[PDB]
Design a protein around this ligand. Sequence first.
Ligand SMILES: O=S(=O)(O)OC[C@H]1O[C@@](COS(=O)(=O)O)(O[C@H]2O[C@H](COS(=O)(=O)O)[C@@H](OS(=O)(=O)O)[C@H](OS(=O)(=O)O)[C@H]2OS(=O)(=O)O)[C@@H](OS(=O)(=O)O)[C@@H]1OS(=O)(=O)O
Ligand code: NAG
Ligand code: NA
Length: 197
Amino acid sequence: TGTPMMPPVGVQASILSHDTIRITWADNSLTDSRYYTVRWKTNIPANTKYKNANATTLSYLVTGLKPNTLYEFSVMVTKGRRSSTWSMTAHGATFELVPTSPPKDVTVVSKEGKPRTIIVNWQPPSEANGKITGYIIYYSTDVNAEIHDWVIEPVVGNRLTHQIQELTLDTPYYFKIQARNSKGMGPMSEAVQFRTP
Ligand SMILES: O=S(=O)(O)OC[C@H]1O[C@@](COS(=O)(=O)O)(O[C@H]2O[C@H](COS(=O)(=O)O)[C@@H](OS(=O)(=O)O)[C@H](OS(=O)(=O)O)[C@H]2OS(=O)(=O)O)[C@@H](OS(=O)(=O)O)[C@@H]1OS(=O)(=O)O
Ligand SMILES: *[C@@H]1O[C@H](CO)[C@@H](O)[C@H](O)[C@H]1NC(C)=O
Ligand code: NA
């Protein structure tokens, strides 16, 4: 007992998924009663509570993380009544994930002059889990029709407005929107009803 113990060296983060980052380290001061405690927290906001975990090996797999999120990691060694201060901090940002929220605040308005033309306006989804690459607008004269029967209107790029031309006058029309990121298409919005003049 010649207190205190040397904190871990060579702390490294390895990105595995949208929710998994693998932490490895080195223990120069090396079967006995000792154990490591891994701590992690989201880089932003500045003040956040740390999550902890015990590990007997010189590795720990941090699970259940937020997608497209940057985390701070540290390790410490605990042996009996002795302990090491926290190690050097390692950083890792989880992979992206398909959006898991639909585009929000969807609105449909007729184009000034041209009534067979409508302007769809929306907002990005909350749970976007990555950079929005684009959107897909679906529309029908039957809200009950299967998604494949609906008219497909791709919206290339992260624009929040789109124009649809050549539609039937004085007709109820229904509108759904879904978002896109590198990992695929996220959910669709609830159908919004708009009757043409
Ligand atoms: O001297 S005693 O055997 O009575 O135990 C007290 C402390 O010895 C240390 C080092 O201090 S010193 O020997 O008094 O100078 O043990 C730590 O280092 C040696 C090997 O390194 S050395 O400096 O080249 O001698 C290891 O073996 S041993 O001499 O203790 O038998 C230790 O490995 S072990 O984990 O104890 O099995 C090593 O301890 S540790 O990895 O740091 O926990 C003190 O530790 S130190 O000051 O942090 O380096 C010993 O305290 S202890 O709690 O009894 O281990
Ligand atoms: C680690 O185990 C120690 C007992 O060995 C306990 O005090 C501590 O709360 C455990 N931590 C976690 C997060 O499992
Ligand atoms: Na993306």
